[PDB]
Structure 1
Amino acid sequence: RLKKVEEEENAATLQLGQEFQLKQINHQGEEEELIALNLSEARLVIKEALVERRRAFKRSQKKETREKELESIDVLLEQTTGGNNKDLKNTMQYLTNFSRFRDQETVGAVIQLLKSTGLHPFEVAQLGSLACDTADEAKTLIPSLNNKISDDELERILKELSNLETLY
């Protein structure tokens, strides 16, 4: 239909793609906002899903320490699934390498703060997946953030996030 070109770049000045935009509708008819994620939040939820499905298989045949955890979830993965997920091994290595918080509670407190701030979701998810403590340097890194946010507010959020998160 008209071949509908629609050239679009992905950036943080609310320059978001159509294919993953914000307001969708879920299949029951309720509105489906976009779920963007933090690196430490993803690091938590992969463990949550893994322990949930592992206990699900425990019921099936019945009827945060990263060095142990990566290899343990690996052997849990080749317990049932295949060994082809070398790139998925690379992904949780990336998650445990650069995720801003190793512990769950700092991430939970940050999200509890952000649920009150009501910031832009993709913006603050990019900020959370990034691991830095310098707001002006982050603005020099991403001129999209430099144009969007004031440096004073950026650092006033960054320090009260930086004191909480596990420094590396």
Structure 2
Amino acid sequence: EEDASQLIFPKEFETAETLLNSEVHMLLEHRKQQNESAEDEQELSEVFMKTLNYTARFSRFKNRETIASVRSLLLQKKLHKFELACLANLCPETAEESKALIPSLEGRFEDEELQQILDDIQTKRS
């Protein structure tokens, strides 16, 4: 029954806080910067290393202000939290591609209304 396509999740996960690829990347980078210092400390694990190199290959933008601006311009809409991560991460070129990838957008908003947002996101990309 758990299918993100139809916007259904467990109660505990419903109240979660979405994260973006750049957001998690900078969080992990700062954690690594803090941990590397303060000698006599248990070093990072392969999980941390793999997650770091996995998120580093999809950092659409390095500027925390870029992250802030995109989330601020996005939250003003009526879309659910789940729509804030996938759409902000994939950065599709056209509204048709976005609608095809995410079935939720089908009929939820106008074509130009979504296309302008997609163009804004692409532009915001560094």
* TM-score normalised over the length of structure 2: 0.76
The one-letter amino acid of 1:89's match is M
Aligned residues: 124
Q: How far apart, in 2, do the equivalents of 1:113 and 1:17 lie? A: 27
RMSD (Å), alpha carbons: 2.6
Q: How far apart, in 2, do the equivalents of 1:107 and 1:115 lie? A: 12
| Residue in structure 2 matching 1:127, options 68, 83, 87 | 87
CA 1:158 to 1:131, structure 2 compared with 1: closer, same or farther past 3 Å?
Answer: closer
Percent identity, please.
Answer: 33
**Residue matched to 1:46:** 28
SS at match of 1:36: coil
CA 1:10 to 1:148, structure 2 compared with 1: closer, same or farther past 3 Å?
Answer: farther
| Residue in structure 2 matching 1:95, options 40, 55, 71 | 55
**Residue matched to 2:7:** 14
Q: How far apart, in 2, do the equivalents of 1:138 and 1:20 lie? A: 24
* TM-score normalised over the length of structure 1: 0.60
Q: CA deviation at 1:163?
A: 0.5
Q: CA deviation at 1:121?
A: 1.1
What residue ranges of structure 1 are gaps of 5+ in the alignment?
1-7, 23-33, 55-72
Contact persistence 2:91–2:118 (CA under 8 A)? no
What residue ranges of structure 2 are gaps of 5+ in the alignment?
none
Q: Does 1:35 align with 2:17?
A: yes
| Residue in structure 1 matching 2:112, options 152, 162, 167 | 152
The one-letter amino acid of 1:130's match is L
Q: How does 1:64-143 map to 2 (within 5 A)?
A: 76=36, 80-83=41-44, 85-117=45-77, 119-143=79-103
Q: Residue deviations 1:53-96, cap 9 Å, x none?
A: x2xxxxxxxxxxxxxxxxxx7xx28x52235x223212111211
Q: CA deviation at 1:97?
A: 0.4
